[PDB]
C-alpha cells in the first residue's frame, strides 16, 4: 500500500510505502476521518492528518458518499466524480466504484497534513511554492495589488506589479514579466461604444414619436376608417 501526502501551506507532495502494522491501524477509517501521525510512524506526535480519497487495487475510485466496504455500479451524470463525458451533452453511464470504508482492497490512500508543527518532514517542509496563473479579473488583481477600497486606473496597478516583479524577483531583468491583462474594467474603446448606444436610443425615440403626430394631422378618424372590415 502507498500513502500520498499533501501539505497545502507549502504546496508540496510526498509518497511513501507503509508497513503491515501501520496499514492495519488504518483499516476501518473513511474519507474525512482524522488521526494523529503517531499511529503511522514512531514520533510524528501531534501532527494531525485528514483522509482525502484513494483507489481499489482493481483501479476503481473510492467515492466520498458511499458508506460501505464494497463495490457497486452507479449511474453517473456529468459533474459526478469518476466519470468524464465528452462528445454528447446529457450522456449518463453506469460504472463500478468503491465505498469509502478502508480495508485490504486499497492500493493507495491520499492524505492532507493540516499543520507540520515543530516537526521537520522531509520534502514537505523544505520547499515553498506559489500558484500557476494570475488573477485576470480586476478586483481579484486589486486585492493582490495590496490595495483595498480605493479607486485607481488599472495602469497604476499594472505599473506597481510590473515594477515590483523587476525589483523583487530579478533585481532588473526581462525574465518573469508574464503577460498581465485585466477584465471587468472599462477601457477607452468601451467608453466610446457605451456612449454610442445612448445616441441610438435617443434618436429612435424621437423618430418613432414624431410619426405618430404626423399621422394624426392627416387622419383624425383613424379608428372609424380602419376598423370597418
Amino acid at each position: 500500500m502507498k500513502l500520498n501526502i499533501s501539505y497545502p501551506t507549502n504546496g508540496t507532495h510526498k509518497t511513501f510505502k507503509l508497513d503491515f502494522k501501520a496499514e492495519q491501524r488504518l483499516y476501518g477509517k473513511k474519507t474525512l476521518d482524522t488521526f494523529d501521525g503517531s499511529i503511522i510512524k514512531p514520533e510524528w506526535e501531534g501532527l494531525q492528518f485528514q483522509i482525502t480519497g484513494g483507489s481499489d487495487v482493481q483501479g476503481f475510485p473510492m467515492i466520498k458518499t458511499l458508506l460501505t466496504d464494497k463495490r457497486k455500479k452507479l449511474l453517473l451524470k456529468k459533474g459526478d466524480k469518476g466519470f468524464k463525458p465528452v462528445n454528447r451533452k446529457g450522456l449518463r453511464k453506469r460504472k463500478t466504484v468503491r465505498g469509502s470504508i478502508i480495508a485490504s482492497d486499497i492500493s493507495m490512500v491520499c492524505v492532507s497534513l493540516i499543520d507540520a508543527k515543530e516537526v521537520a518532514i522531509e520534502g514537505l517542509t523544505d520547499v515553498v511554492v506559489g500558484a500557476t496563473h494570475w488573477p485576470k479579473r480586476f478586483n481579484k488583481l486589486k486585492a493582490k495589488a495590496g490595495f483595498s477600497e480605493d479607486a485607481d486606473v488599472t495602469a497604476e496597478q499594472v505599473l506597481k506589479v510590473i515594477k515590483d516583479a523587476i525589483l523583487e524577483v530579478n533585481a532588473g531583468g526581462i525574465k518573469k514579466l508574464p503577460k498581465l491583462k485585466v477584465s471587468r474594467y472599462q477601457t477607452e474603446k468601451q467608453k466610446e461604444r457605451k456612449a454610442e448606444k445612448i445616441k441610438l436610443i435617443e434618436e429612435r425615440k424621437k423618430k418613432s414619436e414624431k410619426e405618430r403626430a404626423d399621422f394624426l394631422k392627416k387622419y383624425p378618424d383613424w379608428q372609424k376608417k380602419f376598423a370597418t372590415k
Binding site: 458508506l67 495590496g146 523583487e168
Partner: protein
C-alpha cells in the same frame, strides 16, 4: 474478531456464529440468528421490532449517521497571500493603502 454485521437487526456478529443466506437474485446476506431470518420471510419491517439496533437508530434513541449534519471547518482571512508579494510586505501595503484611501 467479528463475522460481520447482521442485515436485518443491525447487530454485530461474533466469529464462529450465525449463517449466510444466498438468494437466486445472486446476493449473499448475513443473519444473527433464525429469529431474524424468519421475520424477514414474514415481511415484518425491522423498524417496528423495538429491541433492534435498526429500530433504535430510526427513532433517534441512539446516535447514528443521519444525526450528524457535518460541515467543513471554517477558516479566517489571511494577510493577502499572492504570488511573489512576500506575506510581510502585504501586511505593510494593505496598511499604506488603507491610509491613502481615507
Amino acid at each position: 474478531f467479528y463475522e460481520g454485521t447482521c442485515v436485518y437487526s443491525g447487530y454485530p456478529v461474533p466469529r464462529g456464529k450465525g449463517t449466510y443466506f444466498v438468494s437466486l437474485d445472486d446476493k449473499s446476506s448475513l443473519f444473527f440468528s433464525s429469529k431474524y431470518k424468519n421475520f424477514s420471510d414474514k415481511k415484518i419491517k425491522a423498524k417496528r421490532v423495538k429491541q433492534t439496533l435498526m429500530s433504535k437508530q430510526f427513532c433517534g434513541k441512539v446516535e447514528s449517521v443521519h444525526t450528524e449534519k457535518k460541515k467543513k471547518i471554517v477558516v479566517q482571512k489571511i494577510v493577502r497571500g499572492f504570488p511573489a508579494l512576500p506575506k510581510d510586505a502585504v501586511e505593510k501595503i494593505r496598511e499604506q493603502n488603507k491610509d491613502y484611501k481615507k
